[PDB]
Short mmCIF file of C-alpha atoms and ligand atoms in Angstrom, two decimals:
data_model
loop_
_atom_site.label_atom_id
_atom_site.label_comp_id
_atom_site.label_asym_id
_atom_site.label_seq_id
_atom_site.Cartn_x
_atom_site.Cartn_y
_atom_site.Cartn_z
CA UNK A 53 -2.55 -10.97 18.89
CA UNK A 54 -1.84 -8.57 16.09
CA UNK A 55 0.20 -9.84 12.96
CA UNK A 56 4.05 -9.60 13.30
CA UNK A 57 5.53 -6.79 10.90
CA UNK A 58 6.92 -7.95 7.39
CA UNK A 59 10.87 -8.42 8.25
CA UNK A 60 12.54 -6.26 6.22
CA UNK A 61 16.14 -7.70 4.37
CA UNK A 62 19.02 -5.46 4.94
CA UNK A 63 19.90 -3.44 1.88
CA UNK A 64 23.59 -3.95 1.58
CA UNK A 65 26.47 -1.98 -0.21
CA UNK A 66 30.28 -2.31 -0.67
CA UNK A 67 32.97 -0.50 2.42
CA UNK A 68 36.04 1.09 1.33
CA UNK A 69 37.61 -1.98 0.53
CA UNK A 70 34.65 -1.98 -1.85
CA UNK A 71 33.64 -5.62 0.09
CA UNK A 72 30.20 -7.23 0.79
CA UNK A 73 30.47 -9.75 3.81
CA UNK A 74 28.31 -12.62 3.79
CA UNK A 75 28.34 -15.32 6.92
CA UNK A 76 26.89 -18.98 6.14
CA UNK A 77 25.21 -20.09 9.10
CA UNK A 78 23.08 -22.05 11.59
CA UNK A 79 20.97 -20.21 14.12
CA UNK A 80 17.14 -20.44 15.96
CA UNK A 81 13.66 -19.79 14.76
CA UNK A 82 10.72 -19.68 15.80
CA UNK A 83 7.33 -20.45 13.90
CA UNK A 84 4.17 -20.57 15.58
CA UNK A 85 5.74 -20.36 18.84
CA UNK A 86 8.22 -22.69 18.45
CA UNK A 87 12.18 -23.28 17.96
CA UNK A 88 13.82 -24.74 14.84
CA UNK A 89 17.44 -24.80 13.81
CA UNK A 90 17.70 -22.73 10.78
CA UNK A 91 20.78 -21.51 8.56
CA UNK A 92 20.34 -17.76 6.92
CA UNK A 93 23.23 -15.14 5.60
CA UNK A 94 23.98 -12.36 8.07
CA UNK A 95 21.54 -14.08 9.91
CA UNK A 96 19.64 -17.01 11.36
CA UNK A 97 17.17 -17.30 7.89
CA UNK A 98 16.86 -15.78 4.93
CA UNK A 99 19.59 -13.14 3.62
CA UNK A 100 20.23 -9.78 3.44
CA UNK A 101 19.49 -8.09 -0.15
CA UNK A 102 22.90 -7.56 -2.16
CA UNK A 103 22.72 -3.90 -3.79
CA UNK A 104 24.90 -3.65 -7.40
CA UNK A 105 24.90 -1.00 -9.35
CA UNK A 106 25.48 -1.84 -13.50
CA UNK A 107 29.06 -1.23 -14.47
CA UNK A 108 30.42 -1.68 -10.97
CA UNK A 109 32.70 -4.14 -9.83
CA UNK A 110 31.89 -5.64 -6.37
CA UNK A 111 34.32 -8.36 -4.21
CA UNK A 112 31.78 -10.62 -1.67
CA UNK A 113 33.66 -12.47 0.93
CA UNK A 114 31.72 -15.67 1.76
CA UNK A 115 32.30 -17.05 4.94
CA UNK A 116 31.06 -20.57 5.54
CA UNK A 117 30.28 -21.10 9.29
CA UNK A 118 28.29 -23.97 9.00
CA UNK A 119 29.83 -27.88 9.46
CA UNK A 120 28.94 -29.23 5.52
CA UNK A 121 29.80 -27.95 2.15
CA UNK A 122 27.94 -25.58 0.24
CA UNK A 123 28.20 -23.14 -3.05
CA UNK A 124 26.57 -19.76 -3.42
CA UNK A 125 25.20 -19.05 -6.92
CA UNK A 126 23.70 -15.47 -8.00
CA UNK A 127 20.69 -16.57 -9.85
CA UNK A 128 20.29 -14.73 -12.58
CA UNK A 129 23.32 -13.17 -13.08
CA UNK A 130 25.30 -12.79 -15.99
CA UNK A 131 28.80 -13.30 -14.75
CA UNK A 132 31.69 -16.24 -15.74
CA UNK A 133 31.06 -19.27 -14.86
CA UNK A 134 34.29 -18.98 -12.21
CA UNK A 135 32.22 -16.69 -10.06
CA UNK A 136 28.90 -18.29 -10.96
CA UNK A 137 28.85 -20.69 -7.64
CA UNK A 138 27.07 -23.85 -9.37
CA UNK A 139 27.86 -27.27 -8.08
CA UNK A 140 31.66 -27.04 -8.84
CA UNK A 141 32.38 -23.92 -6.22
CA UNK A 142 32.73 -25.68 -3.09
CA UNK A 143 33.10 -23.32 0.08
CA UNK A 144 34.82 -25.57 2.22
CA UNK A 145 33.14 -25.84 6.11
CA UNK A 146 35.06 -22.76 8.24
CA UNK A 147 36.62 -21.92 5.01
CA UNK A 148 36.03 -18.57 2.49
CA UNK A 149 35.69 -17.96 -0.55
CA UNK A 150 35.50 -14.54 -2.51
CA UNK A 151 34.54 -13.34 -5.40
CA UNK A 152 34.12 -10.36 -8.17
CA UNK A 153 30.89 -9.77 -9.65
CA UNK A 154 31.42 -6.86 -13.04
CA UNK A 155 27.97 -6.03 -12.84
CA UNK A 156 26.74 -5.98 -16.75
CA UNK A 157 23.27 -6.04 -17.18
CA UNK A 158 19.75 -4.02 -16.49
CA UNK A 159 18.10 -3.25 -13.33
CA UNK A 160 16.98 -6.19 -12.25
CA UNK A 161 15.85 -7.76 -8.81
CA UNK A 162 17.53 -11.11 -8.85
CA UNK A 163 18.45 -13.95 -6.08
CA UNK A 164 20.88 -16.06 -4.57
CA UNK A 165 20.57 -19.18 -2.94
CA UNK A 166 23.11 -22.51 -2.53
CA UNK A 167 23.80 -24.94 -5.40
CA UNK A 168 25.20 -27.71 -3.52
CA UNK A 169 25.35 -30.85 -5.41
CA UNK A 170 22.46 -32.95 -5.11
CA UNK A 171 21.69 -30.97 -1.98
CA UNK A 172 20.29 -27.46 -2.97
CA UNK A 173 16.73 -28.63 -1.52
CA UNK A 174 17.82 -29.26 1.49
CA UNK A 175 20.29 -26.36 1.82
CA UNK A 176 17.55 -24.29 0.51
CA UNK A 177 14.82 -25.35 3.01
CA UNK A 178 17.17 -24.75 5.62
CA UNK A 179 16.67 -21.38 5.35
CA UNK A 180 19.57 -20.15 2.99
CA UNK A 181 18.37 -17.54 -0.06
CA UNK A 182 19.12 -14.03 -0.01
CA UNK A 183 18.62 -11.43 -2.88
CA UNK A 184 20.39 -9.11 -5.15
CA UNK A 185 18.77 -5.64 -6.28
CA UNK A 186 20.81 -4.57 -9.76
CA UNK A 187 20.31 -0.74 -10.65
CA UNK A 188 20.98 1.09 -13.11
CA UNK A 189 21.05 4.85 -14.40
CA UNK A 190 17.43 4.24 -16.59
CA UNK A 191 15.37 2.60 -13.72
CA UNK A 192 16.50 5.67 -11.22
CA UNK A 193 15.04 8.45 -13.78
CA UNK A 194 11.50 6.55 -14.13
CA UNK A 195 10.85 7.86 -9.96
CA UNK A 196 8.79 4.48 -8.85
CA UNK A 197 7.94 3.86 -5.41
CA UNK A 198 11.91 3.34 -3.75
CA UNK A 199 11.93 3.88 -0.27
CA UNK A 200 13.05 0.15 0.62
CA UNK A 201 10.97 -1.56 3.59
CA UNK A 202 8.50 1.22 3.25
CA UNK A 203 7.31 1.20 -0.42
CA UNK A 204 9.99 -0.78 -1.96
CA UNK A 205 9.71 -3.77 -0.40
CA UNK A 206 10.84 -7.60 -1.00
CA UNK A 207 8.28 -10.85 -0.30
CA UNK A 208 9.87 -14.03 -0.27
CA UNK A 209 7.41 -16.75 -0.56
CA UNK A 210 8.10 -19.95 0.88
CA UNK A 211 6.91 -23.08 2.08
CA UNK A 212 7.66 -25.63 4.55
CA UNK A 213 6.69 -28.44 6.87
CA UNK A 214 7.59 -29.40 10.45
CA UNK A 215 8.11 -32.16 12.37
CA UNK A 216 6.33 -32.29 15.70
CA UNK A 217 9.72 -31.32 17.77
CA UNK A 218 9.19 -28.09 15.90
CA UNK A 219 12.53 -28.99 13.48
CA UNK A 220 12.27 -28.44 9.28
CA UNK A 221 11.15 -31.82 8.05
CA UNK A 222 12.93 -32.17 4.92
CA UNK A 223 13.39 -35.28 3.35
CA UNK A 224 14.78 -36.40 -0.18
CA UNK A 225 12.89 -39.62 -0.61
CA UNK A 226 11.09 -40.82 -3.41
CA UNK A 227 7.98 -38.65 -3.10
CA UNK A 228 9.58 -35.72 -3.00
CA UNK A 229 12.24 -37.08 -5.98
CA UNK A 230 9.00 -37.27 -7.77
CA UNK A 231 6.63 -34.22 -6.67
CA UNK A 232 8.59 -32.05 -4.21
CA UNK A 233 9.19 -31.18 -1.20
CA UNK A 234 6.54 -28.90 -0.14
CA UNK A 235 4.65 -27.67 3.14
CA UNK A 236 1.53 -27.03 5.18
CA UNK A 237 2.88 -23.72 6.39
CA UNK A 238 3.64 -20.58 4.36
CA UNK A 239 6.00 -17.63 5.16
CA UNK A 240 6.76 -14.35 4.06
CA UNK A 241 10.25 -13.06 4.69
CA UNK A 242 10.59 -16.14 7.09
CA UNK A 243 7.26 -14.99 9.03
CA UNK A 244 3.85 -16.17 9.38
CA UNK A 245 1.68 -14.06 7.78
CA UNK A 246 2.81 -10.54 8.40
CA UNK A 247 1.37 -7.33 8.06
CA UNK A 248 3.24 -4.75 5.96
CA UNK A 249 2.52 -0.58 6.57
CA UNK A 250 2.23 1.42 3.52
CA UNK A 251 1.46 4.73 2.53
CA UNK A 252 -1.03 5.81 0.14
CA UNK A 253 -0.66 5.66 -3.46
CA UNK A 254 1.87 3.22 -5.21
CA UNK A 255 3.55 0.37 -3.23
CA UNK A 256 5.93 -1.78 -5.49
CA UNK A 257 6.53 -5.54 -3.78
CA UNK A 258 9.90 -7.53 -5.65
CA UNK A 259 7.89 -11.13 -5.16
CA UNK A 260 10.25 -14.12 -5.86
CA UNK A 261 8.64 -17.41 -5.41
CA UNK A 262 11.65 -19.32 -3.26
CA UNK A 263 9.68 -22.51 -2.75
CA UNK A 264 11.43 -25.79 -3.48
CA UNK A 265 8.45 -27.23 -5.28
CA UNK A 266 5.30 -25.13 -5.10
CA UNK A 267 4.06 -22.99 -7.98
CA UNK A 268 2.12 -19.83 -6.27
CA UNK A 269 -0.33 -17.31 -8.13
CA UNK A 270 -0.55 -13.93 -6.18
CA UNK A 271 -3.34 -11.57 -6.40
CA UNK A 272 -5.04 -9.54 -4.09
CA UNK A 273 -8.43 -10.26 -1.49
CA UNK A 274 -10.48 -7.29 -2.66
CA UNK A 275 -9.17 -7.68 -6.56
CA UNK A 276 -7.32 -4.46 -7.18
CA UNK A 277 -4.87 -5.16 -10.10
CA UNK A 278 -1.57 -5.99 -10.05
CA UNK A 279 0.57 -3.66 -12.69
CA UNK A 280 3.45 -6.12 -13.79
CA UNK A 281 6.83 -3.48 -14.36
CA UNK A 282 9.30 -6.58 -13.90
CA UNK A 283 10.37 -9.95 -14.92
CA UNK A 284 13.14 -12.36 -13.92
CA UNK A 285 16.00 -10.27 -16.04
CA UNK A 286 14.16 -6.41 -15.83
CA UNK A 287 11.86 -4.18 -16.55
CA UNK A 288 8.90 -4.57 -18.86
CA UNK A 289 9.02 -2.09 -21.84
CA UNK A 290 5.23 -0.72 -20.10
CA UNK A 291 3.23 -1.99 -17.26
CA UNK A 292 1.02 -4.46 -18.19
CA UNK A 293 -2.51 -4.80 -15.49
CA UNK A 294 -3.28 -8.73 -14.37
CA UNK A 295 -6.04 -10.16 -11.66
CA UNK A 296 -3.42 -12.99 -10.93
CA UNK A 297 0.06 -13.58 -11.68
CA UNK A 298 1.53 -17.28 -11.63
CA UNK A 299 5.13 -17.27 -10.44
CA UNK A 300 7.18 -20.37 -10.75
CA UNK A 301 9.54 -21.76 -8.79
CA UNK A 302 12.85 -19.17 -8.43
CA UNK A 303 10.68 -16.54 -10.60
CA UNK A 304 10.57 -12.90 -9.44
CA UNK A 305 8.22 -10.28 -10.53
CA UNK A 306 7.82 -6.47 -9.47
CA UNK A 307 4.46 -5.39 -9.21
CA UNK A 308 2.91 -1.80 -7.93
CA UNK A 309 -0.47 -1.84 -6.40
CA UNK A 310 -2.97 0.83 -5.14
CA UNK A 311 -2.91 1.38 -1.43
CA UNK A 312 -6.08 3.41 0.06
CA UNK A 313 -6.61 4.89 3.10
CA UNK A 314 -8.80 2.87 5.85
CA UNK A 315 -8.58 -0.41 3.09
CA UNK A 316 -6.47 -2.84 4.38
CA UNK A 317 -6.54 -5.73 1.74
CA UNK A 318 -3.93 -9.37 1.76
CA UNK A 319 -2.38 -10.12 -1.14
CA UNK A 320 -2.86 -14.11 -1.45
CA UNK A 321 -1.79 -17.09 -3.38
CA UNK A 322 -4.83 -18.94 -5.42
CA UNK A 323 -4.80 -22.66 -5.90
CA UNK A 324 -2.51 -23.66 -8.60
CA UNK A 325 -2.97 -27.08 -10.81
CA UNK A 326 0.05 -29.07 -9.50
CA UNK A 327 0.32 -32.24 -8.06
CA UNK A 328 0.05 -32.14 -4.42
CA UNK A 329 -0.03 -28.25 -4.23
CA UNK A 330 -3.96 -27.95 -3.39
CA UNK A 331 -4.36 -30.05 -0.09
CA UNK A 332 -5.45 -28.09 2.92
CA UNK A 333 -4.79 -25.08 3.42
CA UNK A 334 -3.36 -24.45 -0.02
CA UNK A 335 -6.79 -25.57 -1.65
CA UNK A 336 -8.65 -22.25 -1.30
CA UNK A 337 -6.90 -18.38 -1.49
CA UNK A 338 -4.08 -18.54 1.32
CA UNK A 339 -3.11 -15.08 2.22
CA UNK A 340 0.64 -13.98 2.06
CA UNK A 341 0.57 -10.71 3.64
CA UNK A 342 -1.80 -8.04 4.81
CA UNK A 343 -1.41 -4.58 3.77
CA UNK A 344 -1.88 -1.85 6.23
CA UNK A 345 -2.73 1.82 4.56
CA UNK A 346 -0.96 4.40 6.31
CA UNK A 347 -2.30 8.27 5.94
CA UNK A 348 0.34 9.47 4.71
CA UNK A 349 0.99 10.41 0.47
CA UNK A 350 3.38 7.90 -1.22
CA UNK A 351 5.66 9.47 -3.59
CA UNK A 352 5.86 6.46 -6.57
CA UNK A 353 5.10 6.72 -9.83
CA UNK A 354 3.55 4.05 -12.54
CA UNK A 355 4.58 5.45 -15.40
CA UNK A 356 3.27 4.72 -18.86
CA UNK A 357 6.72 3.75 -20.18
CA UNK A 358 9.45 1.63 -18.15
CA UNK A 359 12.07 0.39 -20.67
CA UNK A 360 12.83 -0.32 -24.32
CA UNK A 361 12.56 -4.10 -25.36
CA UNK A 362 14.58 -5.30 -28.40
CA UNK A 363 13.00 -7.04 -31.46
CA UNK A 364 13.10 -10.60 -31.40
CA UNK A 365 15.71 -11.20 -34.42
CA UNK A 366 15.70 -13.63 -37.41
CA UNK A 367 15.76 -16.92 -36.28
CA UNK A 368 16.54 -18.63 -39.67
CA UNK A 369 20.42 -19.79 -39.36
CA UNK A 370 20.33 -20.01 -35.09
CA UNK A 371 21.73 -23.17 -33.63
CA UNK A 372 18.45 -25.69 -32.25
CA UNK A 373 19.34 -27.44 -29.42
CA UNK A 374 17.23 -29.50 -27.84
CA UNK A 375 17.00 -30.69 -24.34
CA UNK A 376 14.46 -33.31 -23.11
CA UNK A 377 13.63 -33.57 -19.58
CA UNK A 378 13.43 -36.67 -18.05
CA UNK A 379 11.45 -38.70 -15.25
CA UNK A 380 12.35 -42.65 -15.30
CA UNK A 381 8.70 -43.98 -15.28
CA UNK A 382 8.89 -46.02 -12.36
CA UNK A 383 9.83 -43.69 -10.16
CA UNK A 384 7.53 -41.30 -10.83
CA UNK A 385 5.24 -43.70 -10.64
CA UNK A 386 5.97 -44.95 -6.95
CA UNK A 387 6.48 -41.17 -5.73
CA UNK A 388 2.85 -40.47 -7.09
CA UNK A 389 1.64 -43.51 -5.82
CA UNK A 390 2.73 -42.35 -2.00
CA UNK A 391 1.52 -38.89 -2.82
CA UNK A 392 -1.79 -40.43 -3.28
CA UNK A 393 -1.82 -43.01 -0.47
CA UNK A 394 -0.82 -40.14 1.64
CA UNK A 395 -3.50 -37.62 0.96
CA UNK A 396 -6.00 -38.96 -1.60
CA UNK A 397 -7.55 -37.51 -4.29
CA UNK A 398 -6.71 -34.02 -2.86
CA UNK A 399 -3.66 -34.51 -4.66
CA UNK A 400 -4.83 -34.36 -8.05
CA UNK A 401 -7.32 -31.20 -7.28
CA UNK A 402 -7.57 -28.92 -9.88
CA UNK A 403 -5.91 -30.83 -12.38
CA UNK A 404 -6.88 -32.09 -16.03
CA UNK A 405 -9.90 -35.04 -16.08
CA UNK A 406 10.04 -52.55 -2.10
CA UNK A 407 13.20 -54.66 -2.31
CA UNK A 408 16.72 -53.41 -3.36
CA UNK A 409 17.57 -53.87 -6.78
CA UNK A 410 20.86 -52.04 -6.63
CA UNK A 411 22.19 -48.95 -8.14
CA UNK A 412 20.78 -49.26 -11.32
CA UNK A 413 17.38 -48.12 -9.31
CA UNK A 414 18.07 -45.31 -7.31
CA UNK A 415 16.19 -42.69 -7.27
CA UNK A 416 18.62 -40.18 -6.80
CA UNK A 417 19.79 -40.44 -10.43
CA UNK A 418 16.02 -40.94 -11.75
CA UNK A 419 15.61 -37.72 -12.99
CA UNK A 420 17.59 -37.04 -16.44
CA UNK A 421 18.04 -34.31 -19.38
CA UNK A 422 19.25 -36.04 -22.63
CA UNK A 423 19.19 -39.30 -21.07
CA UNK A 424 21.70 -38.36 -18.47
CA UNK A 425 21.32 -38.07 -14.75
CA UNK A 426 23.77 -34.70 -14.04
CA UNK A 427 27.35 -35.71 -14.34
CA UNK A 428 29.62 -32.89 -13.10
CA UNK A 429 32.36 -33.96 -14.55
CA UNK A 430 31.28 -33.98 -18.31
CA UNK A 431 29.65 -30.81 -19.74
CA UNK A 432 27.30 -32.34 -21.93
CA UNK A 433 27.49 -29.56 -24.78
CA UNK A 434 30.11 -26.14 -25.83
CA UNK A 435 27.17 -23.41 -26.53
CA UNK A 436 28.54 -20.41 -28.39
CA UNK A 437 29.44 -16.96 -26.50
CA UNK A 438 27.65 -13.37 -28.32
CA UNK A 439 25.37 -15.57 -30.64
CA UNK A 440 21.79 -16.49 -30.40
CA UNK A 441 20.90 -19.90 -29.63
CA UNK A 442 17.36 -21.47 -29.59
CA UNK A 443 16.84 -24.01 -27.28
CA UNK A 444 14.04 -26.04 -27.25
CA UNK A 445 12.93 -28.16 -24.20
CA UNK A 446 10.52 -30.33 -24.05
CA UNK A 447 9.01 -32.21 -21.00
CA UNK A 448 6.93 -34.73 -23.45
CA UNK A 449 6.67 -37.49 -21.35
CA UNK A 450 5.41 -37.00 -18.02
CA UNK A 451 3.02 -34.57 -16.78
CA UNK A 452 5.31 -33.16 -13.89
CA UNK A 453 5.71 -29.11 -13.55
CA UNK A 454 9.34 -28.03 -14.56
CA UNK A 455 10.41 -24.62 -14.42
CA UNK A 456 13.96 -24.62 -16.46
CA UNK A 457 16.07 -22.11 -15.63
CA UNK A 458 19.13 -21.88 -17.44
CA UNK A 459 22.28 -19.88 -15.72
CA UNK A 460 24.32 -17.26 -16.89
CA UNK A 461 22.24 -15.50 -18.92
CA UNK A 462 18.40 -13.81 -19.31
CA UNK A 463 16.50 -15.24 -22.43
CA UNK A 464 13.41 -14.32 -24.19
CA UNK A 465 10.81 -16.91 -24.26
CA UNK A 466 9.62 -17.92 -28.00
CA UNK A 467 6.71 -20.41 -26.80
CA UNK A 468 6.34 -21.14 -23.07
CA UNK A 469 5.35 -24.98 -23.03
CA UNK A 470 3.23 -24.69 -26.52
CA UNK A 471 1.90 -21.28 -26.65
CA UNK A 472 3.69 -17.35 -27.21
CA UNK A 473 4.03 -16.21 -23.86
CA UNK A 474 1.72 -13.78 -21.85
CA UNK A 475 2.93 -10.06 -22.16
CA UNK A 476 4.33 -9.77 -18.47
CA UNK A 477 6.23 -13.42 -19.57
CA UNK A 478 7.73 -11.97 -23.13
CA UNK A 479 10.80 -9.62 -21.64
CA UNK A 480 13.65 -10.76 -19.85
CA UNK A 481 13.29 -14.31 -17.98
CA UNK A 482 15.86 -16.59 -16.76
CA UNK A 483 12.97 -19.53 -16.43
CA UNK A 484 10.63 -20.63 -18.77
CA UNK A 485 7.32 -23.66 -17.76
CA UNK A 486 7.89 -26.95 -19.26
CA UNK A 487 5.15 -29.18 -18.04
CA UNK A 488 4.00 -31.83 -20.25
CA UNK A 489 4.97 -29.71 -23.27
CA UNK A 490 7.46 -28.49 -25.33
CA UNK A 491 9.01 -24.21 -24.77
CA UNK A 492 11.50 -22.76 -26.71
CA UNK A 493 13.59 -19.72 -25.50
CA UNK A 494 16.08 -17.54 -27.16
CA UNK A 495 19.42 -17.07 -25.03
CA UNK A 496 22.84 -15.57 -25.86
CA UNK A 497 25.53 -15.73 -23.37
CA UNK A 498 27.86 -12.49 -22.74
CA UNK A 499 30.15 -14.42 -20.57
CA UNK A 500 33.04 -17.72 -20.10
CA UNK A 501 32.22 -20.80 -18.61
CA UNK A 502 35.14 -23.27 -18.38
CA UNK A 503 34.42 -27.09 -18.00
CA UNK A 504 35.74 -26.36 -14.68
CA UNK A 505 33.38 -24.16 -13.85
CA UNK A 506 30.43 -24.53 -15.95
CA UNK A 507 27.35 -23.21 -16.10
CA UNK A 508 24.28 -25.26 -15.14
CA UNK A 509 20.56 -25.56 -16.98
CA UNK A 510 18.40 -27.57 -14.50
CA UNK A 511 15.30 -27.84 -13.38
CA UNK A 512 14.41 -25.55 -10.38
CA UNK A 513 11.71 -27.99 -8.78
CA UNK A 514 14.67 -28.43 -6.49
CA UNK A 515 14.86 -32.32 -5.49
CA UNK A 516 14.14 -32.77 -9.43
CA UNK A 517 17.46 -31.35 -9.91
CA UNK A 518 19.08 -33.07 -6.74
CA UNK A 519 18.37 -36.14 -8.92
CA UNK A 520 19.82 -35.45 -11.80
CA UNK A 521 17.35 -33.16 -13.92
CA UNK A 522 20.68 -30.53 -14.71
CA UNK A 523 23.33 -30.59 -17.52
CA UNK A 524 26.79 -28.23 -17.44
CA UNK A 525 27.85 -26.56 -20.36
CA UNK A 526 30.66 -24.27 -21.28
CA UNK A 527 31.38 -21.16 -23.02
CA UNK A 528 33.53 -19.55 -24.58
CU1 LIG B 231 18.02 -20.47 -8.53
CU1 LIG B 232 20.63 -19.59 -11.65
CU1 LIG B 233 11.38 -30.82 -12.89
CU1 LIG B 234 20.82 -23.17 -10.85
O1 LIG B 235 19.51 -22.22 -9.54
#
């Protein structure tokens, strides 16, 4: 059998009413032949991609059409915390809810996903994540590749596992509290290993890692480059050429790559040093996608210059705040343990040489910033609107992988977890690695968050966050 074509997100802009309709729901899949209940946006999995243009307003209606609660949150957009969707905006099952997004910042290819409380893993496994494609009047003049689903195209990279009956096998125990949830089988836009058709010359691929748990590290079979134009929050101020490129957990990059006739070549995901991420088939290359060349001239340009990045400023006189991730030790311990017992020494590859005690012991508050499990009703500090902050956050203290992603605005990483970031990692990012380490970014936030609403800074190895690796805080 040939490969199945890469699905292709619908690109979606505003009617007359100048409205974007989104459906929550549950619906079939298939994978590998066989039928699981999944829950998508304007669909059965997955999402449509959400087209805004900077300086535009936009009204979504969200229609929730499945039988629980859930939120939708635009991550990585810089809007109020009223319209932000974190844990506090409950779309009631069969209910709606709407919403105004004032577009205000660069071109951008960002995400959105659920932010249920203590249930974004498994609302996110499910199948729910769509994304959001920002332009603006500078990224149309530059001419890159833009034909979307042709050479513009979006690869969602996710995991998951299945029980025998064919069903998602999700489960927030305390493993997964500890590690992850993560899979044995890897899909691209929801399929198995597609093929994507491109023409010759540039193709540009918006990759966002939507994983729960697992880090990935694209590059290609053959080893063309990958030219980086794009981080998290926009374009890079050039291109800057890697072999690989690591994307955490919610992370999105843009890359163009060189398509030749009569080459076919995958791009693939190399082994990363995480716990549990390198057991069969994820211990060797694992290919993503295949990429068909097509005889026919692409019209994309790389050009030499993409954008104009700001000087870092003075940081003498900026607030520190600091924010200390959290495991409680025994957990951790325990969920490693079974991680081990499970699958062996596998489980460490690649890395560096029973009774009820009550609710003091749960593991679904083990996981802590500050010394607090997330508590939704108390924002746990007032950060200032239009100023620079530097927050520093350090995950001293266990050597689990936490990408920290802090809402409602796009930062500039100072150190990522000890060391000045890479060039591709030093524009605009909305998550920054803390893993055994201490980063420190440099964030300003253009917009309100009321404690009502607050915006969240959290962990995005999902179940860490589920239990309780997130603070609120306000604005404004
Ligand atoms: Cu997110
Ligand atoms: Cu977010
Ligand atoms: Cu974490
Ligand atoms: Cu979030
Ligand atoms: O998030």
């Amino acid at each position: 059998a040939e490969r199945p074509t890469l699905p292709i997100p619908d690109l979606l802009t505003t009617d007359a009413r100048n409205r974007i309709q989104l459906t929550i729901g549950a619906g079939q899949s298939t994978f590998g032949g066989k039928t699981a209940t999944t829950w998508g946006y304007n669909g059965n999995l997955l999402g449509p991609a959400v087209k805004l243009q900077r300086g535009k307003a936009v009204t979504v209606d969200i229609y929730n059409q499945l039988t629980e609660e859930t939120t939708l949150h635009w991550h990585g957009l810089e809007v109020p915390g009223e319209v932000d969707g974190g844990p506090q905006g409950i779309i009631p099952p069969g209910g709606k809810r709407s919403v105004t997004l004032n577009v205000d910042q660069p071109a951008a290819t960002c995400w959105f996903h659920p932010h249920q409380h203590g249930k974004t893993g498994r609302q996110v496994a499910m199948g729910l994540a769509g994304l959001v494609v920002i332009e603006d009047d500078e990224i149309l003049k530059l001419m890159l590749p833009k034909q979307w689903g042709i050479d513009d195209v979006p690869v969602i990279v996710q995991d998951k596992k299945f029980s025998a009956d064919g069903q998602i096998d999700y489960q927030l125990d305390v493993m997964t509290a500890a590690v992850g949830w993560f899979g044995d089988t890897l899909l691209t836009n929801g399929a198995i290993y597609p093929q994507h058709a491109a023409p010759r010359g540039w193709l540009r691929l918006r990759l966002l890692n939507g994983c729960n748990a697992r880090s990935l590290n694209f590059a290609t079979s053959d080893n063309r480059p990958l030219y980086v134009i794009a981080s998290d929050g926009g374009l890079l101020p050039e291109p800057v050429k890697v072999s690989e490129l690591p994307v955490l957990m919610g992370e999105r990059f843009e890359v163009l790559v060189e398509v030749n006739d009569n080459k076919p070549f995958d791009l693939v995901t190399l082994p990363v040093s995480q716990m549990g991420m390198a057991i069969a088939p994820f211990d060797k290359p694992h290919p993503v996608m295949r990429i068909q060349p097509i005889a026919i001239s692409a019209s994309g340009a790389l050009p030499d210059t993409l954008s104009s990045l700001p000087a870092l400023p003075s940081l003498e006189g900026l607030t520190v705040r600091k924010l200390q991730l959290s495991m409680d030790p025994m957990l951790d311990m325990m969920g490693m343990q079974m991680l081990m017992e499970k699958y062996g020494d596998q489980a460490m590859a690649g890395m560096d040489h029973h009774m009820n005690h009550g609710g003091k012991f749960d593991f679904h508050h083990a996981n802590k910033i500050n010394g607090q499990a997330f508590d939704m009703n108390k924002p746990m500090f007032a950060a200032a609107k239009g100023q620079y902050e530097r927050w520093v956050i350090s995950g001293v203290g266990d050597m689990m992988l936490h990408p920290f992603h802090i809402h409602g605005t796009q930062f500039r990483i100072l150190s990522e977890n000890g060391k000045p970031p890479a060039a591709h990692r030093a524009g605009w990012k909305d998550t920054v690695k803390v893993e055994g380490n201490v980063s420190e970014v440099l964030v300003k936030f253009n917009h309100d968050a009321p404690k009502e609403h607050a915006y969240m800074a959290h962990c995005h190895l999902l179940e860490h966050a589920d239990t309780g690796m997130m603070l609120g805080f306000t604005v404004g």
